[PDB]
Amino acid sequence: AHSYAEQLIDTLEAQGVKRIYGLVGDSLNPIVDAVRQSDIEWVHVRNEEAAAFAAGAESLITGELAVCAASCGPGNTHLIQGLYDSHRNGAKVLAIASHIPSAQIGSTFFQETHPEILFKECSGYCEMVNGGEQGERILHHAIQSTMAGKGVSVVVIPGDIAKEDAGDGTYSNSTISSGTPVVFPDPTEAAALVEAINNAKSVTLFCGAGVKNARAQVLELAEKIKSPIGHALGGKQYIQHENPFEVGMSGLLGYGACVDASNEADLLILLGTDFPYSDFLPKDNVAQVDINGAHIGRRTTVKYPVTGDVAATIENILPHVKEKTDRSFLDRMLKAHERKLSSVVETYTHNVEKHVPIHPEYVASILNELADKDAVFTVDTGMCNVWHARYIENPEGTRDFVGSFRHGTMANALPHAIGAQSVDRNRQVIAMCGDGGLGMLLGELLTVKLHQLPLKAVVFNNSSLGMVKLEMLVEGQPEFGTDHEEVNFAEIAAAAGIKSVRITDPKKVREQLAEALAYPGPVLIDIVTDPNALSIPPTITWEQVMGFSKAATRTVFGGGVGAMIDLARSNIRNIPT
Amino acid sequence: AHSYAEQLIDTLEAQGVKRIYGLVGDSLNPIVDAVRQSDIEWVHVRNEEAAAFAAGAESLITGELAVCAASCGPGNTHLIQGLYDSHRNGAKVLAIASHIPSAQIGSTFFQETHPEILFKECSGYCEMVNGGEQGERILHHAIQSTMAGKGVSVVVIPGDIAKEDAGDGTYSNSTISSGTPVVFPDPTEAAALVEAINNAKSVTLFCGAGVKNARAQVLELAEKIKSPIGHALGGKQYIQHENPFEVGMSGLLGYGACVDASNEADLLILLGTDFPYSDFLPKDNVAQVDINGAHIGRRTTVKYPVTGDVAATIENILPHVKEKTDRSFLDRMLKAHERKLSSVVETYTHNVEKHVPIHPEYVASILNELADKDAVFTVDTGMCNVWHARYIENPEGTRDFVGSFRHGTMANALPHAIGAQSVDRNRQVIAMCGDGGLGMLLGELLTVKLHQLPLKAVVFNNSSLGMVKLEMLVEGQPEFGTDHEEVNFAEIAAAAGIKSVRITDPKKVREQLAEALAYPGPVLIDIVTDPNALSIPPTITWEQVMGFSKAATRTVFGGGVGAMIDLARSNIRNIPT
Amino acid sequence: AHSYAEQLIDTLEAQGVKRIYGLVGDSLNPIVDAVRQSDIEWVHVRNEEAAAFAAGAESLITGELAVCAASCGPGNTHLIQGLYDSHRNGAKVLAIASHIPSAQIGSTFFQETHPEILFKECSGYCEMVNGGEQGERILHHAIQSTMAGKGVSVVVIPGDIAKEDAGDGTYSNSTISSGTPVVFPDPTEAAALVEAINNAKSVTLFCGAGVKNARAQVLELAEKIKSPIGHALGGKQYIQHENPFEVGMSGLLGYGACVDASNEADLLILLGTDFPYSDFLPKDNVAQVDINGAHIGRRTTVKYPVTGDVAATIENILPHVKEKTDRSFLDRMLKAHERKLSSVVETYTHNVEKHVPIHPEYVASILNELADKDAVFTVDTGMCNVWHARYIENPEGTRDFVGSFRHGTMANALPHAIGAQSVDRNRQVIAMCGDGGLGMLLGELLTVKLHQLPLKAVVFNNSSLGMVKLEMLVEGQPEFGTDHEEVNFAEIAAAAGIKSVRITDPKKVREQLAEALAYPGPVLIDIVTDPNALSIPPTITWEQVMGFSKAATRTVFGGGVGAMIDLARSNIRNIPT
Ligand SMILES: Cc1cc2nc3c(=O)[nH]c(=O)nc-3n(C[C@H](O)[C@H](O)[C@H](O)COP(=O)(O)OP(=O)(O)OC[C@H]3O[C@@H](n4cnc5c(N)ncnc54)[C@H](O)[C@@H]3O)c2cc1C
Ligand SMILES: Cc1cc2nc3c(=O)[nH]c(=O)nc-3n(C[C@H](O)[C@H](O)[C@H](O)COP(=O)(O)OP(=O)(O)OC[C@H]3O[C@@H](n4cnc5c(N)ncnc54)[C@H](O)[C@@H]3O)c2cc1C
Ligand SMILES: Cc1cc2nc3c(=O)[nH]c(=O)nc-3n(C[C@H](O)[C@H](O)[C@H](O)COP(=O)(O)OP(=O)(O)OC[C@H]3O[C@@H](n4cnc5c(N)ncnc54)[C@H](O)[C@@H]3O)c2cc1C
Ligand SMILES: Cc1ncc(C[n+]2csc(CCOP(=O)(O)OP(=O)(O)O)c2C)c(N)n1
Ligand SMILES: Cc1ncc(C[n+]2csc(CCOP(=O)(O)OP(=O)(O)O)c2C)c(N)n1
Ligand SMILES: Cc1ncc(C[n+]2csc(CCOP(=O)(O)OP(=O)(O)O)c2C)c(N)n1
Ligand SMILES: [Mg+2]
Ligand SMILES: [Mg+2]
Ligand SMILES: [Mg+2]
Questions:
Q1: Cβ(A439)–Cβ(A382) below 8 Å
Q2: Within A72-170, where are the H helices?
Q3: Rounded to an integer, what distance in angstroms lies between the CA atom of residue B285 and that of residue B279?
Q4: Are B59 and B66 in contact (CB under 8 A)?
Q5: Dist. CA B561–CA A16, nearest whole Å
Q6: Is C406 exposed, middle or buried, given 0-12, 13-18 or 19+ CB atoms closer than 10 A?
Q7: Are C129 and C135 in contact (CB under 8 A)?
Q8: Cβ-count burial of B39 within 10 angstroms (0-12 exposed, 13-18 middle, 19+ buried)?
Q9: CA nearest A222: which of A360, A327, A303?
Q10: Which residues, in sequence order, are CB contacts of A99 under 8 Å at separation 6+?
Q11: Under a CB-based contact definition with an 8 Å cutoff, are residues C542 and B5 in contact?
């Protein structure tokens, strides 16, 4: 007979898990012994928070289960930031939360916590093992819940019970459902959407991450009804590239004509998006297609709700949607889009290649050009989100992106890159780090060195909490607490045994970044950038930066955009005569 | 400008809510004033627990939102049993939990509780209002969550904030998605199910509540592959009637050949069921079709998982499923089914019409014959669940049933009947009450009298917690705490102003129950029944009654069955020669 | 070897527990079998909510542990209202929450709930048993926590584990600390209070339940510094009787000069009170003595905080407090107090003995005169709280009182009386019931009959939610939802086998109530009272009734007072010349 720890690891191995991220100790020793004897690799991190980020990033890249593990009490407590992030991102993650010995539960014991209560908000399933047999059962339920799309699962395992005898295999013997059902809409909701589209003279589509598997259908619908296509940040990687109807992104980090096209069309269709900034959304005549009905109408007035998959809904309605031959609205919005992008480049990035200290938008433009066509980019929360949104492209859809776009935590970039890089050491992974984010989990440079992960950590080092400095400028409150003395991350990385370079001259950015990106190993690129590069229209308020101003707005943060302008201009040249 | 209380009630009225069940007080006075001025009826109950049961039953009958409401602190605390029941039953219920004044939150004030924390387990959405505008928003989110099938929603409203100004209408103006999407399976999961069916020589279908809208498809599949059809208790009302393949129900309250057909077939297919008694389920070769992937494999080994709707999955696979011409397995199971039903009638209900005290199975047989073809039956948890399962039929599918089949609470029958009867006073509603259940919420007889609800409360009065007496007999522990001195519910009902009859002679059951069921008003029927009528095989253990014995079993509680035997016998006579 | 169920009951028996209140079923059968074999009596209730109220009332009367018990899932869910009440009242209660079988936890099983999470707010200790040995340990910890004054303890016991082997006795062998430590104040805080008293020319003491064991010390301090003594409702039973400095109670149910004496004195001292209605409390110069430092300053500005016991603090300061020879303030407040009480009697209860329907204040005056000198009174939340506060006296301190004065739940009176009466069947127990409260848990009349508890249920039957009708009159909102058709509780009680009388003529109240109170058995007294008897000053607002108006007030609800005026008048006649 095997123990429950051995059955746990055999079940994960049989499901194809290749790695577990974590930090060993106490109630986790029987589980780590079983890992040693299996083909699963143990990936040691310095802070268990990084293990939960790394597992979430691995799962977003692979589309499969990923796993993190931590010791009792304080050990598993450290998972929590990464579990919130993974849960909000819809990752397929199992967290093994080792727990104090069962006989000491309820006695205010050394290290006691109640993880089975603490992790309820950052999980779709979270239960405690109380015996080997029941442990097999709740491991199945946890894996089946996360694979069905319910978000993070936590299994809480008192250390003693991991050494108890395994269950009889009834539940570990099951095949897990990991398929993708095809969700067609209710015919009554679909018919109301057809009527709304056919009655409208102009339509705009606004897409989010829910169009990941619906590019062909969204483009086919747009060609038929001559609709501009805008996106939320979660839709950018899927719908912006090679899109003849492209009109940009809404929100403060937005760009182009998206806000105007969304608000001026007779009908706006929200496709697979939960974009939260309601002040940028119209209310007059909006449809929304979402696979989770509970999300419909969360962000603005929706008159035509449709619970359904985007691709299946468009396939179902298309034969009933009339072709629109008038593309005057689309042409006006494509022209306004290109004019707006050209205008922000002229206003904000004139001679940006000579700006000192180095302008982060110059770095981001060069990074987009130099990085591989299939690189993974990870994005630290803060001003790196602006540089990703406005400069990092996805030609042919072959790059991947991982960030904290929903939970919005700092310090995610380097741990996300550790997980993404572990999937395939031959694929380039670029972590766009802030100095605040990197400092917050600095010890994970020791993890990169230990595992020899050949990721490229690009530090936008401006010695400032740049996004907070923006929020304070916008509020009109004296700058305080954001900027501190400079740190030399290249020297810290070199002291940790990582190849590094420090870039201070804009004239050497292109050559030094090309050399670093081509280095066959881990490398940290410490770029000293301008802390005052973020430009802000004086009319933006702290209530808008914080997201609680409901009054209609079309204003975005200042700054330029990058290579997205090439598609905007080819779309103008291809407008039918 | 309106207040938030007025906007709350206008939004519910615009959505078609006709009634709110509750008990007025304190922070709920502004909301009740708005109800008075609207077309919504206030249905006063004596204990707010009954309001939450009544709302859950109303929604199960109508398929639409139902609403309950209660005052701060202790008032809304009383909702909780009915919210768990409604939530487990998948009802579409909004609970308005009035709360203490916002300025006193956090001060250990008079009546203070934290309902926004307490009701997390019995809801899919539960949040606190902190201003009129945000209150409009979370009311929308709560209604959209319950209408999308996520279970109960709770909106917690500090009393003072109900008098604050209303939001601007952005969220109340939305149309709620209440449609039913059509969920086809992933083609890879569907193809594996086709291969399993075509490889199997014999197949049995085991259906639950998830086949509600798939009768035609289940029967078409059964005719093609010659499969017996069994059911869980939640499937009985939908699949047993007019079913040429009928083989009964599994579990301790089960009957017929279902356990044998499910365990002897080469392949068992679980269709829309989460039947929890794993010791009755095989493990060797099982498929499961469920619309919620997280439920697959919860109860036994599943080798062919399919996330999908039952009807859409069967429609998709049918052209690829080969017709089976050999119906030897089906014929053997139909013959065994009828033999087993005839045997339990001969063993347990010989001369049952002369048994004294009155046998509850004699009452249940007469109640099935006399009740209307479209009656609603509500079923009190306990031995009434056995009498429903084995005696109350659903010819042509026109009756409806409400019970606590998942949460398993006592005392639900009379409050469920209050909600079901409020939907249509011209429809017959029969509450199958136990003396324990009725005593537990006895004050709701005052509610029946106040609202003149013409329901028929049939009390199986055996002065005993009959199901607990069974559990103790099965364990082999001396009877204690279950049986107490007799109560005259007919005299209590008459003292409350309700028409009543007391039935003690088996020779008068048919005439007295016919007269009472035909009474044009509320009526309580107090039937003095035999507390020792539940027969138990000595091999049943307390571990089996409690549901924690995993060893394979086919043993059911003793007792007979009713009119279901007529279909069993016609199915034998129609077996092709 | 014994089982954990047997060890649980042996441990309670060894600690002196005489009874357990509850309702048998499932996971509780092994525990009830152990009770049968012990000397503990099982007290069957009809709804487990009543068991938790009865245990809380028993403990308040005895000063010892009391116990309630309920079955898994829905069974223990029903305890919750009574656990909140017992917890807020500081009762010493163990709740045995039977739970689903451990192997099914986490599987969404039949009846599954998580009581170990649900009951966190209504308990000081709440943990789950996961084995027999750890179960012995957390039973000790639960008993020691409640006996040390931390409020309710809940032990959650999966049914299967109750049959597991008992622990080794290490923790059940301990003696529980149930002593009362003597908490002297910090000398620095005490010296600041001495300076405040000696600097003040006039002082008023305002006492709550924390003066229970400090009557002699409070009176000695008042004689020395010539201070009026007022009380919160929780202090009334301890400090009003035979008090030469008595000036009444504050709050809307208040009376006499208390609000004026508290606000006009140079120094107000809060002694053992957490009175929550801040608009009645001054802010200028207030001291507060409380044994729980976290409570100091919860309700108004406190300049002289003292963490300490009332009696020990007064004993410590008394030698340093200077005698005040000027009693002009005390004399002015004693005269104003008696004038105010005489005025409300003249305004509101002129010829009250002839008022029809019967006036509840006439009933309350007669009930105070006729009830025994050592009776227990239980008080249903609602208008019965006004009648208790203004009419039920405690001469020589020999009566006891139980109510829901902090949690404020309806329906507590009859279940509180069941627990208080079970302590000593020879002691008179009077339940002051409202028709709303009694209807809410009406089935507990069957409990009174079953156990032959000789309590006297006095129903103030006005067919109205009287306190809510007051709140609506005060708000100026049309009356709705409070008054319904009349119920005959005397006929319902007689149908339940309880002696009853229906009183409708004011001329027969005294004789019929005297006869009923002297009946040697259970009796229900259904008094048809005037629903419009509660008088309200038009200046009271719904914000004041709800407790969120902070503006200074001295206004109380209209109505008269009773025999308290005799002490007010003797105190005037004894003012030194
Ligand atoms: C510092 C910072 C600033 C930010 N600023 C902005 C900004 O200015 N602009 C911006 O756009 N974002 C911004 N974001 C991100 C923003 O908060 C949201 O996370 C993002 O807009 C949501 O993108 P989304 O709608 O694509 O994804 P989600 O919020 O994940 O929504 C996806 C939706 O698709 C649905 N869905 C999934 N699959 C399907 C399917 N097959 N069919 C149908 N529906 C489906 C889901 O149910 C869900 O409702 C910022 C983030 C950070 C960290
Ligand atoms: C005292 C008592 C005794 C009991 N004894 C028994 C007994 O002996 N036998 C018994 O059978 N029950 C018994 N029960 C009830 C039992 O506990 C379960 O509640 C019941 O078996 C579950 O029935 P079900 O599977 O139909 O419903 P559910 O548990 O509600 O499961 C329905 C399933 O269908 C799925 N679904 C819903 N819609 C669709 C769709 N369109 N397509 C696909 N899937 C869908 C759901 O996701 C879910 O998994 C008892 C109850 C009581 C109160
Ligand atoms: C419908 C209704 C209306 C009400 N209206 C009123 C009203 O108008 N007026 C009114 O007064 N009440 C009213 N109440 C009750 C009110 O809400 C409070 O519960 C009550 O005033 C508190 O009384 P208390 O301060 O004595 O008790 P508690 O709130 O229990 O406070 C006792 C304090 O004493 C402290 N303490 C305990 N022992 C010691 C010790 N040995 N030494 C020192 N400190 C100690 C405790 O830590 C605590 O802070 C009403 C109740 C109801 C149900
Ligand atoms: C753990 C955490 N702390 C604080 C914040 C708030 N926050 C959001 S962005 C930001 C600054 C991020 O700093 P850095 O990584 O240097 O990037 P910058 O904005 O300068 O690019 C801060 C403080 C956060 N979301 N997460
Ligand atoms: C609130 C609650 N308390 C206890 C139980 C446990 N229980 C389940 S069935 C049963 C007896 C039900 O009694 P009654 O209504 O008289 O029906 P009977 O079994 O006699 O038909 C009990 C105690 C429950 N599930 N719910
Ligand atoms: C469970 C519960 N529901 C509602 C309330 C609100 N409430 C407080 S007093 C009151 C009326 C009490 O009625 P009754 O027992 O008839 O006494 P009355 O005020 O008429 O004397 C109500 C509705 C409460 N606190 N508890
Ligand atoms: Mg920075
Ligand atoms: Mg019974
Ligand atoms: Mg009343």
A1: no
A2: 74-77, 80-88, 115-118, 132-147
A3: 15
A4: yes
A5: 49
A6: buried
A7: yes
A8: exposed
A9: A327
A10: A27, A72, A73, A76, A105, A115, A116, A128, A156, A157, A158, A159
A11: no
Structure token digits, residue C569 = 């008048």
DSSP states along A235-299: GHHHHSTT-TTEEEE-STT-BTTHHHHHHHSSEEEEES-----GGGS--SSEEEEESSGGGTTSS
Task: For residues B363 and B354, give the distance between their C-alpha atoms in angstroms, rounded to a whole number.
Answer: 12
Residue type, C39: D
- CB-defined site of ligand 1, < 6 Å: A 208-210, 232-235, 249-254, 272-276, 289-292, 295, 309-310, 381, 385, 404-406, 408
Using the Cβ of A150 and the Cβ atoms of chain C, whether some distance falls under 8 Å is answered with no
Question: Is beta strand B182-184 parallel, antiparallel or unpaired with respect to A182-184?
Answer: antiparallel
Closest protein CA for atom 10 of ligand 2: B233
CB-CB neighbours of C187 under 10 Å: 9
Between helix C215-225 and helix C310-317 the angle, nearest 10°, is 40
3-state secondary structure C299-338: CCCCCEEEECCHHHHHHHHHHHCCCCCCCHHHHHHHHHHH
Pairing verdict, β A125-128 and A153-158: parallel
Contact B406, B151 (CB under 8 A): no
C179 burial (CB, 10 Å; 0-12 / 13-18 / 19+) is exposed
CA distance linking residue B111 with residue B34, whole number of Å? 24
- The CB-side HSE value for A265 (13 A sphere, CA atoms) comes to 34
The secondary structure element, H or E, covering residue A505 is none
User: Within a 13 Å sphere around the CA of B370, how many CA atoms are in the beta-carbon half?
Assistant: 21
Cα(B173)–Cα(C349) distance, integer angstroms: 54
Q: Name which of C387, B558, B312 is nearest A182 in CA terms.
A: B312
Q: Residue C419 and residue C421: Cα distance in Å, rounded? A: 5
SS3 of residue A230 by DSSP: strand
Contact A44, A450 (CB under 8 A): yes
- Please tell me if the CB atom of residue B312 comes closer than 6 angstroms to any atom of ligand 2: no
Q: Which two tokens stand for residue C542?
A: 């719904």
Q: State both tokens at A250.
A: 């809404």
Biggest alpha carbon–alpha carbon distance for chain B = 80
Helix (H, G, I), strand (E, B) or coil at B533: coil
Place of tokens 């070769």: B285
Q: Residue A388's closest CA among A336, A431, A346?
A: A431
Q: Is the CB of B82 under 6 A from ligand 5?
A: no
Strands of the sheet containing A267-271, edge to edge, are: A246-249, A229-231, A203-207, A267-271, A286-290, A304-307
Question: Which structure tokens are listed for B8?
Answer: 């709350």
Burial grade of C489 (CB within 10 A; 0-12, 13-18, 19 or more): buried
DSSP three-state, residue A42: strand
Residues of A in contact with B307 (CB under 8 A): 148, 177, 179, 181
Distance CA A175, CA A159 (A): 27
C-alpha to C-alpha distance for A85 and A547, rounded to whole angstroms: 20
- Strand B153-158 with B182-184, pairing: unpaired
Sheet (strand B153-158) strand order: B41-44, B19-22, B66-70, B93-99, B153-158, B125-128
Question: Residue A531: which of A487, A490, A491, A482 has the closest Cα?
Answer: A482
| Deposited experimental method | X-ray
Angle (nearest 5°) at CA C207 between C203 and C212:
135
- Is there a cis peptide before residue C187, judged by omega within 30 degrees of 0? no
| Binding pocket residue ranges, ligand 6, CB within 6 Å | B 23, 25-26, 71, 74-75, 78; C 380-384, 408-410, 434-437, 460, 462, 464-468
